């Protein structure tokens, strides 16, 4: 009910280091694929933790 939101901007994003931080199984990606996140790029990325 009080979920955080961190703004990520003005940086180079490497999505292959996410697998080392947390012991999950796989991504659940809508609209994109988790293995094609490095060949294209966005404007603003958020992160919500709960």
């Amino acid at each position: 009910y009080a979920w955080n939101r961190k703004r990520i901007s003005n940086c180079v994003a490497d999505y292959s280091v996410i697998y080392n931080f947390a012991p999950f199984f796989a991504f659940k990606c809508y609209g994109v694929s988790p293995t094609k996140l490095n060949d294209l790029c966005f404007t603003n990325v958020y992160a919500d933790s709960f």
């Binding site: 947390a22 012991p23 199984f25």
Partner: protein, 50 residues
């Protein structure tokens, strides 16, 4: 043994099947039936039905 479920070891066995036109050598436990000709029957020639 103290890591999470995402970093635990996994054993992977990959089976590869060859759908070539070579004579088949790996076939299951179904028994065979004597050949009949000049009669409208149903046939099963190495998995090809008709």
């Amino acid at each position: 043994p103290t890591y999470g479920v995402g970093h635990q070891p996994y054993r992977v066995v990959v089976l590869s099947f060859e759908l070539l036109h070579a004579p088949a050598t790996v076939c299951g436990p179904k028994k065979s039936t004597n050949l009949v000709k000049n009669k409208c029957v149903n046939f099963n020639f190495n998995g090809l039905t008709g």
